[PDB]
Amino acid sequence: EFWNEYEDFRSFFKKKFGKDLTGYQRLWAKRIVQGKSFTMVAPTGVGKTTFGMMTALWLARKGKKSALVFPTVTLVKQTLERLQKLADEKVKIFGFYSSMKKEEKEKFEKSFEEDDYHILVFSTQFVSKNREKLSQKRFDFVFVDDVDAVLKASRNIDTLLMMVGIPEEIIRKAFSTIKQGKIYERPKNLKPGILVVSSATAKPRGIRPLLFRDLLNFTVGRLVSVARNITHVRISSRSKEKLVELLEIFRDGILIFAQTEEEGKELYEYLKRFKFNVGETWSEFEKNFEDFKVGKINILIGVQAYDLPERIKYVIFWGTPSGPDVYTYIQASGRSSRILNGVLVKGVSVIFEEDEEIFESLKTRLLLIAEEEIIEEAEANWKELVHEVEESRRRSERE
Numbered sequence: 001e002f003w004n005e006y007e008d009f010r011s012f013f014k015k016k017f018g019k020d021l022t023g024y025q026r027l028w029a030k031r032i033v034q035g036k037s038f039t040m041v042a043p044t045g046v047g048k049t050t051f052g053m054m055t056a057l058w059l060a061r062k063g064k065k066s067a068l069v070f071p072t073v074t075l076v077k078q079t080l081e082r083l084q085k086l087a088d089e090k091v092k093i094f095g096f097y098s099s100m101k102k103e104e105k106e107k108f109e110k111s112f113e114e115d116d117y118h119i120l121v122f123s124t125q126f127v128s129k130n131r132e133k134l135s136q137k138r139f140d141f142v143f144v145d146d147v148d149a150v151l152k153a154s155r156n157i158d159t160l161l162m163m164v165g166i167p168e169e170i171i172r173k174a175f176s177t178i179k180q181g182k183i184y185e186r187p188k189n190l191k192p193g194i195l196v197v198s199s200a201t202a203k204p205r206g207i208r209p210l211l212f213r214d215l216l217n218f219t220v221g222r223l224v225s226v227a228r229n230i231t232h233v234r235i236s237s238r239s240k241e242k243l244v245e246l247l248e249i250f251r252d253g254i255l256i257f258a259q260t261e262e263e264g265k266e267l268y269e270y271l272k273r274f275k276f277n278v279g280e281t282w283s284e285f286e287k288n289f290e291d292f293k294v295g296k297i298n299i300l301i302g303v304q305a306y307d308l309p310e311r312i313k314y315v316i317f318w319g320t321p322s323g324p325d326v327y328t329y330i331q332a333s334g335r336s337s338r339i340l341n342g343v344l345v346k347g348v349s350v351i352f353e354e355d356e357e358i359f360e361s362l363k364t365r366l367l368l369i370a371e372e373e374i375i376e377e378a379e380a381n382w383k384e385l386v387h388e389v390e391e392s393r394r395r396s397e398r399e
């Protein structure tokens, strides 16, 4: 599935270029197989340009289109030259530079408007002067040789992002959101091209990288998503009464995770007895799950080891996931907090746990991994928590 593709590329490179992939070119190639956008940081000599060129070539096999962008006229000539000696004559490769032959230009220009091309090669000045025409193209791959040159104009950053299939409205909405110091999430139904930039110095400025990581399927930065706004509260008992009190104020959108299917059956019965609008996962998943998603049901009990942030507000753990399996705790609790319509909605997770040792393990681990704290019942401002939950959600639905 994924390794096969990488190797196909591996072989192709070896064959066409004449040598092996370098350590760096191998790391990069895997990325480009998982369709990841990235920033090339590496000292000059490693194999960046050659790789960007060979990538273009390989993608042109799948009929995919590329654009290669260099800071200087010499690099445009050089790369153009190499590319035309290396290509199967079937591959349509056009380049452009001011000092070009009038005949060669028109050839470019003709192919550029007819979209009869696979690989285009030009300079940062072409990008500056053809913002309109370029913005109307979707490329499967865009390689920018020295990004510090073209980063100079914010206008050009936009164009690049547009050349990979990202509509201006989305760039405007992302930039704006970042302006307000909030989180942007790219729409996952949009499948933009790959953007790879070479940075000579891993330059400082904060905005380009943010815009990029937000809009492009970038290399993963963090192990725990910044999109978590959750308070963890621990009650040191398995009291059903105490659970009932929490239910009484939580009221809606509640997930309960039992350690076993029996433990979850005992609770279900107890909550059905006290006439709570409840449902379980085991007997009839899809019916209950959709009643919960609708509103018909307020509480969904389930079992650890197995709907919508709109819907999930409160997560309750009837016993700590055994391990503690912190990974599962983190995923589950993370259900109660998700960016919704541009808003990082509020969530609350409560753990019923008698065992001090178990809970001490989960607690220290969670602080080490998520950097998130687990407070005791008595530190908990239920009124503020519930309010945060309701109001955060109420902002989201303003759309």
Ligand SMILES: Nc1ncnc2c1ncn2[C@@H]1O[C@H](COP(=O)(O)OP(=O)(O)O)[C@@H](O)[C@H]1O
Residues within 6 Å of the ligand: 019, 020, 021, 022, 025, 042, 043, 044, 045, 046, 047, 048, 049, 050, 051
């Ligand atoms: N995989 C490889 N194995 C051996 N030599 C390579 C490889 N890739 C590129 N080269 C050679 O290294 C030289 C410089 O590489 P280049 O792609 O220009 O790196 P950078 O963009 O980091 O300066 C080129 O002349 C090229 O022939």
Ligand SMILES: [Mg+2]
Residues within 6 Å of the ligand: 048, 049
């Ligand atoms: Mg180079």
